[PDB]
Structure 1
Amino acid sequence: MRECISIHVGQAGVQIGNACWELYCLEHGIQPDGQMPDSFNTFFSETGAGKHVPRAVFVDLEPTVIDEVRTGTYRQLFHPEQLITGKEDAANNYARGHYTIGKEIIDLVLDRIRKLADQCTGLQGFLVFHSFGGGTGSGFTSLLMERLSVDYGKKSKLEFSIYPAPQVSTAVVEPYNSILTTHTTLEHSDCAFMVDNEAIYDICRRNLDIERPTYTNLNRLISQIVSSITASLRFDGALNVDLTNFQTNLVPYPRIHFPLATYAPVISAEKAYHEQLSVAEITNACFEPANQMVKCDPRHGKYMACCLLYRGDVVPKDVNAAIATIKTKRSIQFVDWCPTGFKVGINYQPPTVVPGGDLAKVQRAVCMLSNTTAIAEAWARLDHKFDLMYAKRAFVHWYVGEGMEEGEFSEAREDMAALEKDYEEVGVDSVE
């Protein structure tokens, strides 16, 4: 009745999806064999038997990760129809993944998407998971998003983009991939969620006391975020909320749709006690900049819009009191022309702890989605890097030989500057 499909590009996308579907299975009490020893109708379809399968699509050019998924514990769960594999990865080259190699299987992915769509009736939207550094990520995301937006006129489209960290990088040509893919996705993405690895590293080390965190833990956190986002659809609440509500409440202007996510509470198992976890307490934890999942201090900007999804046993009266108190603060400042920048959603289902995980089970949790102007600053940094790596025309020859024009780089930089200018200009106050 209300279905939403998933797409995973690149190794980051695939691992994030592993965590996400793991979490969803844990939620709806689903065995790795599609059995459950309605709720699940949104994400799981049901075969003739009592077995269920997830409406998921996995795509990559390197078959190693998909082979790992097939040989992983969640083997029997997936439908081997969707586990699309290529031959050679884009190799951190947007040109390969957007002009040369992605063409080989773009048709196959589109066909699988259409077949899944035809068997669904309450199609809500697309959850695209993909990094930015990897050429697979940028190239295939650009291609697939363009194709889908061409096909379906107006349907929800959500991305969970792994924004490259300011200093902690892994690749070398990350500015190029990021700039190209952002210039592309600026026109197609309904609403994209920036997430950085460095911020999650900081959060896990300081708050969860894990001195050496692995990618698994970051994937756990992002899966928690996604589950809390969709819990309003997947369950009932005193005040539910849909994705169209989000896009209506968080997009004052058609271009500015790049919020960031935050989650709470996050405390070690040994620290489950020693605090009562007030709704005001978790509110403060959310709004504390040390918990925001993108390396930007909101105190340098204004929250243009904020949304809070609570799950568990919550009461709107105290929630409203805490929010009103938050508004009374000074450093948390919004635009003058926006009188109220808060949307509230409540769900009765508390989150469930991941077995073998690192967090501790709680009775109330809150996810925050904030669209502010501080995030604008982040873009500038990347442009900075790009400019240097573009001043010497370094690494350009790979893309040139792959069928790309320098004018594309110039125009992408111009579009990034235009977006940053729009962000800053909206950040200003109104006359009279």
Structure 2
Amino acid sequence: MRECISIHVGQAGVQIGNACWELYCLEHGIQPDGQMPSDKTIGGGDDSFNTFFSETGAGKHVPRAVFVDLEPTVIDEVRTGTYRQLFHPEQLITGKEDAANNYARGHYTIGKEIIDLVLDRIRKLADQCTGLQGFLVFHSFGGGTGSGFTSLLMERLSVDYGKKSKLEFSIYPAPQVSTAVVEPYNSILTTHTTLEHSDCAFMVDNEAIYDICRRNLDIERPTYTNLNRLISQIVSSITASLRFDGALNVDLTEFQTNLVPYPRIHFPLATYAPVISAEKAYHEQLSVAEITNACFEPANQMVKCDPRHGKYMACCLLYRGDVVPKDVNAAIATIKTKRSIQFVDWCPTGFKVGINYQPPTVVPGGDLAKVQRAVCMLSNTTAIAEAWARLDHKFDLMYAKRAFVHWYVGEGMEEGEFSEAREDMAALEKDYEEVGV
């Protein structure tokens, strides 16, 4: 048993971490004070859930988690909310003023003055780890903290923990719920500085979550709470293999092994089904075939793009609920005949399948209905490069006028970092094009 430390950075990181850890606690039967009755090994263990929770002598199960924001208001709500007892104070770290939606203010100015405190607190968790395998880092692309402080932190983690795996859950920027006009700048900057420090990144585009909430949850104007319960469902689906008995994706190195052949193209697309409103009176429960088939509708992707005009490098199917292999194989067999699924020549056409028989846990009073079976597909398609194109385009429009650049330069950043980052992204986009056309 090998431990996992989750790091939540900025507003989007912290609020999503709240949602995930609430889910986790529901799933493992951990109460809000941190007590798990089914845990007969009191005070310790090397169980599967222990990769995410440590135990105290008093039978308290405590998330291997650090929350870090450069201003206090959001983590203060953790400190005073339902799961206050769950987290030990030293793990909730706040600053005095945020990064003002400014990557360079989070990376350089305010980052430099809190990076060492954060690393010390992270070391205090690592030191409680018999065999730490690495880090799950949650953050937005668009926030000033979310981008700038996160990239600084990733650089340092690579130095203080060089053999350890680092995974990203990254919120991609969408106008409908965005908070700043400079989010493309920050997105590109943080992607470029973090690219070589991340082994596998799951990008979630707020545009997709927003439309999924509207279409399938009949939520007219989704909030962050709606978005985050849905995203936490997806995240839980992705991590369940680190927290439960199984043979698929059991350590972080296996995510890279199974999902990232070329190290630079490490952005797997996540597709999730079914998403059913709790207010649906009569729901006909969907079959393995129906939900597996939904895995290939763009409208269920965490990022809107068209995998038909790309190539696959890998594909993993994670089921939860009443699923057995032969039904999965049947579903796949018919899907292959009816759908455009092209793998790259140097890769097998196939699917690694993971099934956990416990169906998804849903937040009592939430928006999602309980269901008998659900699936998250993780596929490394080149089609996700569409999302980089969009982003890079929005950058190129602004940067051609050097609009807003003075705010970055005034923080100590040099104009050249902009064009450097953009050049890296042009590389990335070309790598995708060459792998997939």
TM-score (norm 2): 0.93
> Do 2:285 and 2:372's aligned partners in 1 also have CA atoms closer than 8 Å?
no
Aligned residue pairs total 427
Cα distance, 1:167–1:234 mapped onto 2, change above 3 Å: closer
Cα distance, 1:361–1:122 mapped onto 2, change above 3 Å: farther
Cα distance, 1:164–1:404 mapped onto 2, change above 3 Å: same
Cα distance, 1:137–1:238 mapped onto 2, change above 3 Å: closer
Alpha-carbon displacement from aligned partner over 1:96-127 (angstroms, at most 9, x marks no partner) = 11111111111111111112111111323211
Q: What's 2:34 paired with? A: 34
Cα distance, 1:15–1:169 mapped onto 2, change above 3 Å: closer
Tell me whether 179-188 or 118-127 shows the greater mean CA deviation: 118-127
SS state at 2:279 partner: helix
What pairs up with 1:75-86 in 2 under 5 angstroms? Answer: 75-86=84-95
Q: In 1, distance between residues paired with 2:93 and 2:121?
A: 10
What pairs up with 1:133-172 in 2 under 5 angstroms? Answer: 133-165=142-174, 169-172=178-181
CA RMSD after TM alignment: 1.8
Give the superposition deviation at 1:243: 3.2
Q: In 1, distance between residues paired with 2:350 and 2:398?
A: 39
> Do 1:176 and 1:386's aligned partners in 2 also have CA atoms closer than 8 Å?
yes
> Do 1:311 and 1:351's aligned partners in 2 also have CA atoms closer than 8 Å?
yes
Alpha-carbon displacement from aligned partner over 1:142-177 (angstroms, at most 9, x marks no partner) = 110000011222222111111112776431111110
Give the superposition deviation at 1:273: 4.6
Q: In 1, distance between residues paired with 2:266 and 2:82?
A: 37
SS state at 1:277 partner: coil
Cα distance, 1:330–1:30 mapped onto 2, change above 3 Å: closer
Cα distance, 1:122–1:195 mapped onto 2, change above 3 Å: same
Any unmatched runs of 5+ in structure 1? 428-432
Cα distance, 1:302–1:129 mapped onto 2, change above 3 Å: same
Give the superposition deviation at 1:348: 2.6
> Do 2:277 and 2:368's aligned partners in 1 also have CA atoms closer than 8 Å?
yes
Give the superposition deviation at 1:274: 4.0
Which of the numbers 122, 141, 158 marks the counterpart of 1:113?
A: 122
SS state at 1:91 partner: coil
Cα distance, 1:156–1:149 mapped onto 2, change above 3 Å: same
Cα distance, 1:133–1:271 mapped onto 2, change above 3 Å: same
Alpha-carbon displacement from aligned partner over 1:56-115 (angstroms, at most 9, x marks no partner) = 101111111111211212111110011111111011111111111111111111111112
Q: In 2, distance between residues paired with 1:389 and 1:151?
A: 36
The alignment-based identity, stated in percent, is 100
Q: In 1, distance between residues paired with 2:171 and 2:394?
A: 17
TM-score (norm 1): 0.94
Q: In 2, distance between residues paired with 1:163 and 1:303?
A: 21
Give the superposition deviation at 1:332: 2.8
Give the superposition deviation at 1:190: 0.3
> Do 1:232 and 1:346's aligned partners in 2 also have CA atoms closer than 8 Å?
no
Any unmatched runs of 5+ in structure 2? 38-46
Q: In 2, distance between residues paired with 1:234 and 1:366?
A: 17
What pairs up with 1:31-430 in 2 under 5 angstroms? Answer: 31-37=31-37, 38-165=47-174, 169-237=178-246, 241-271=250-280, 273-427=282-436
Q: In 1, distance between residues paired with 2:251 and 2:330?
A: 24
Tell me whether 313-322 or 75-84 shows the greater mean CA deviation: 313-322
SS state at 2:66 partner: strand
Give the superposition deviation at 1:254: 1.6
Alpha-carbon displacement from aligned partner over 1:23-61 (angstroms, at most 9, x marks no partner) = 111112112111224353121111111222111101111
> Do 2:273 and 2:375's aligned partners in 1 also have CA atoms closer than 8 Å?
yes
> Do 2:16 and 2:228's aligned partners in 1 also have CA atoms closer than 8 Å?
yes
Tell me whether 264-273 or 316-325 shows the greater mean CA deviation: 264-273
> Do 2:49 and 2:244's aligned partners in 1 also have CA atoms closer than 8 Å?
no
Q: In 2, distance between residues paired with 1:25 and 1:5?
A: 16
